[PDB]
Structures are given as structure tokens and as C-alpha cells.
Design a protein around this ligand. Structure first.
Ligand code: CL
Ligand code: CL
Ligand code: ZN
Ligand code: ZN
Lengths: 30, 21, 30, 21, 30, 30, 21, 21, 30, 30, 21, 21
């Protein structure tokens, strides 16, 4: 595939795409 | 974390899988 | 605020808005 | 759970806020 | 909740979330 | 342009594109 | 109204443009 | 207006309700 | 209508809106 | 990666993520 | 085609990748 | 191309139709 800059809501839309039913955590403080 | 890896820097779809449950 | 009807990626967008820098966890059934 | 509730029925922002870290 | 920068289409998606059936106005000239 | 089938937040995205700096009003029934 | 028309049936960009300020 | 309050500056979800009908 | 800056995923959402069933190509290298 | 259920503009968002700078073509039936 | 498959049934990222230039 | 016309610069909805099939 590719590497791009994924920021903000775009980052969590990509995590949704990639993870799906597994679920995911978005933790920007780290 | 995810912001540094994917927004500030650049990440692949595989690196994004690191944050799946 | 009003009640929401959110499916798919629209839930993840809403969580992103609600949580901000706190981030969140997305955990579907099964 | 929340994911299913917001989609099959309705949910509030206050219920969503429970899933923040 | 939190405070973030909401711009462009992201701003009107947040107004949609927040206002819902009430409706809203987006008037950037002011 | 082609005809559109738009629900939820997708309508608000389309209005945003169509109206630009003019902005718009979003007014659902009831 | 437009909100319902675009979702239950179809609508055009020209009809949407009517809702601009 | 909304842009200055929410994009240029920073606003809460409650301030956003100021632009509801 | 208007002219705005349309970038990234926002650009392809606008092409989707505008083209619809015709389909479209997104080719950033040119 | 997980399998996807994507309609409308959500397909175009997924193609955008998958293809990056390569871009893509969107070609619906009929 | 892919557009219809991903919506009426399911599709994979690997199938989508076929539509990249 | 599209990026230069629409992102770097500024384009109308009609110019965007130049990239339809
Ligand atoms: Cl952006
Ligand atoms: Cl949808
Ligand atoms: Zn949708
Ligand atoms: Zn954006």
C-alpha cells in the first residue's frame, strides 16, 4: 500500500478502516 | 504515539494496525 | 445536545469530536 | 454495546463521552 | 467535553452533530 | 452534475461544497 | 423538505444551491 | 463569527450550540 | 456555485459528489 | 486488515487511504 | 463491480488496491 | 493536474467535472 500524513478525524477514520471489528484505541497523549 | 508516527511523521496501513485491539 | 443515530465510521467521527485530546476507545461487539 | 446502540437505536453525546480515555 | 480547532467541512460536521433536528446556520462571513 | 442521494451528515458535506464562503442553512423537518 | 428529499429520493446540486446564504 | 470562534480560535461543543436554530 | 481549496480526502469526496455514476479518476502525479 | 462494508462516499474514502499518491479510479456500474 | 460488491456484500483492502493507478 | 488546480490553487465544481469519466 502507501504511507501518508493521517491527522485528526482522518487518523481515526483510517484506524476504523484498518481495525474494523477488532476495535482500536486512539490515544494522542500517548 | 500514533500522532507522532502517523500525523507528524508518515505511517503505513500496517503501522496503523499497531493500534487495533 | 440532541440524540444521535450513528453507524459505521459516523460513530468514530462523533467519538473524535466528543473526546478531543483525551482520545477514546472503539469497541464493537464480536 | 455503544457501537450497536447508536446504530440500531439512538445514543447521546453524554453516553459517548463514557468511551473517552 | 473538550475544545478543539474545527475548520471547513469538519466545522459543519460538528454543527450537524451538536444541532441535529434543530438545524443550524453556517455563516462564515459572519 | 449528477443527481444525488444524500442522508445524514452527507447532506451537510454536499451543502458545504456547494455553498463555499456563502455558507448555508440546514433545516430538517420536525 | 430538502433534507428529507435528498435522503428518501434524490436531489440535485442546483436544488441544494437554494439553501446557500 | 463561527470561524473565528471555532477554527481560528478553539471552541467547545456548547459554544457550537450557539449556531443551532 | 463557488471556488474553494479542496485537498486530500476532501478533493476525492468533491469528485464523488460532482461525478457520481459517471465515475472519475484521481491522479495526483498528474 | 479486516473486510469492509462500504457504500457511497465511504468507498471513495477507503480507496483514497489505500492508494495514496498513486491515486485511483472510481467506476460504478451503469 | 467493486463499487457494488463493497456495498451489497463485503470487500477487502487487497481487492480495493486493484483500483489504484 | 487536479492537485495543482484544486488544492494548491482554487477550483470550481465545473472544473472538477474535468476529472469525471
Ligand atoms: Cl484538514
Ligand atoms: Cl451512510
Ligand atoms: Zn455515511
Ligand atoms: Zn479534513
Amino acid at each position: 500500500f502507501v504511507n501518508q500524513h493521517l491527522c485528526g478525524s482522518h487518523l481515526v477514520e483510517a484506524l476504523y478502516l484498518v481495525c474494523g471489528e477488532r476495535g482500536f484505541f486512539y490515544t494522542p497523549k500517548t | 504515539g500514533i500522532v507522532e508516527q502517523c500525523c507528524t511523521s508518515i505511517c503505513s496501513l500496517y503501522q496503523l494496525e499497531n493500534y487495533c485491539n
